[PDB]
Chain length 198, copies 4
């Protein structure tokens, strides 16, 4: 049926001071809200293309279908990764996963931070699981749909779009990508991981 904008497991301001409630609202209710509709639209148009056997604009339908389903898919997980009782570090299976995968949790943080802070333009930092080589990796996502292989299982995302922190951190993304760690929903992450390795 249709894609729909999902509910937060918390109150828009749950995250201060690390993330502005202000931001959360706009993000969820505005920006997510949107991808959810483009998503639905593009699908719709393909529906119609095929029904009229006219794929003149195929290039454009695949690009909008890609772009919104993708922002929709990342913003959904972004929410789940966030949490007011989140923070510290991962434990057990995931935590181990991490150190063998990146040496230590700090090693991983580090790279994750670099990943995120150097996107040239819009983008995201993502920890995904490689079913290919059963590895744990970090990709630097450009925009919402580019720069990683098909089949990767997402684990922890961190929105680096300017609308993700400009109201608060302004031009200092560095500060925002730091704050980020203080609300990370490790639980959600650990679940995501278990499932993917299963």
């Amino acid at each position: 049926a249709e894609y729909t904008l999902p509910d937060l497991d918390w109150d828009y301001g749950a995250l201060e001071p690390h993330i502005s409630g202000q931001i959360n609202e706009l993000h969820h209710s505005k920006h997510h809200a949107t991808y959810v509709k483009g998503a639905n639209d593009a699908v719709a148009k393909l529906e119609e293309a095929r029904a009229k056997e006219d794929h003149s604009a195929i290039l454009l339908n695949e690009k909008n279908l890609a772009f919104n389903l993708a922002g929709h898919v990342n913003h959904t997980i972004w929410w789940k990764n966030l949490s007011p009782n989140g923070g510290d570090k991962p434990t057990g299976e995931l935590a181990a996963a991490i150190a063998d995968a990146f040496g230590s949790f700090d090693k991983f943080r580090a790279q994750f931070h670099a990943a995120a802070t150097t996107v040239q333009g819009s983008g995201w930092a993502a920890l995904g699981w490689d079913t290919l080589g059963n590895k744990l990796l970090i990709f630097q996502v450009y925009d919402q749909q580019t720069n990683f292989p098909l089949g990767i299982v997402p684990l922890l995302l961190l929105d680096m779009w300017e609308h993700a922190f400009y109201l608060q951190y302004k031009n200092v993304k560095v500060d925002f990508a730091k704050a980020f760690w203080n609300v990370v929903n490790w639980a959600d992450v650990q679940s995501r991981y278990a499932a993917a390795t299963s």
Copy 2:
């Protein structure tokens, strides 16, 4: 451990006349061969970055890791999708999947063809399963790692890179994307699908 170039379930010329044996060789032994090594390299470099806690070139490591693991991941499936005893149409569960998903198998072919034939530059045509909205969709992949959402399960791919058909079809990709259907490994596709819906 490392990524490795996989073995074909057939003899390089199994596919004539639809695809030149010549091509298959070059493709497998040359082009795939390569992505498999970049893949391994980029991983390696990240290993080293972190070990030297120097992520100055993070942008470049994530881009090479993305680009080769991605060509590696697509060329692997590309092989499996191909088959000398392949062809005709899908049956059962997948075949049904298809008609409710794109109206008919011809409707789907059509769109799939358009998808593929209009890439602006390098690229691929891909049928992937949406775990999000449990849908069956077609994406137009640019290069090897761009233009589709994270978490999509690949089902049927069709390499549209010039090195995929220039020796044979020259500038007429249209002809090649047609021939394509005659060696499609529906079996492989139907399996891929069952698994993803499971």
Copy 3:
């Protein structure tokens, strides 16, 4: 010698209420400031690559050289296009240029607005002169360095990066791309045009 961040021909708040002084500062002193240094860096690195005859990271040097020189080049013109005594419409030669080129000034505005408001991610709207076919065209720039032909002469740019209006307009870029017209430096534009046709 080096690229340098240029001086504004006005006071940071000259532009309210159409553009926040706040924004102008950040933009100029922060974001521009930056591209000007990446610009200088990347150049520097190429200098060094060649001096050590090691172009292992060529991919990355060309990408940073492209990306910063490009943001540097667009933000420079962006400033010049802006003006507190700007506005209304173009006159004379340019104004004529425009109507034969896009039918009317409103026709052109319209398209220019659409151009800008639909970028998928970072980007800009640009009016450039085609020395090829001596035409006047509008391109939709992605990020800072992609989506237009080599040799185009820039005439009027409009920054659509989220950091260009989020503090003020928040998620409503539409509103910002409207306000835009009220400070357009037609004079600067008309000069730019004369020169290019010469």
Copy 4:
């Protein structure tokens, strides 16, 4: 008026053995031929959009207008840069330009080669003149329209698209990017340069 496919200043095989006559034909008469029409089309469509004040597909019109005018613009210069009586090295003003700009002609070759040989996917290697910082630089062009700043003056291009050498060199682009130098039209380059500095 319209963009038109230009005439070569030589016979399709003028370039063997360095470039296959076969290739030249296909390239000129097929691939160029095409960009010249997309070019004309996209323009046409914008014409129509505006006439119907319907810019729903603006994203797609700007992308096709960008992509074909760009391949059209690069392939045009590509022809001019090529020459049967070409080769050796540049002289006078340009030659000097080069050594102060990249240290030596070999330093420049080197970087130019690296530039070209590592494109990830489609792309080109380009020497352009920076009116910004009056510099001489090399950019790595992705596809046909991405990866360099607006306002760069093209000087020497080298098509790295697979259809530019696969028939001949197959997967060994390295060999082709070498051969390249043997037909470079320095004259054309030296003129291009004089003009740009003027």
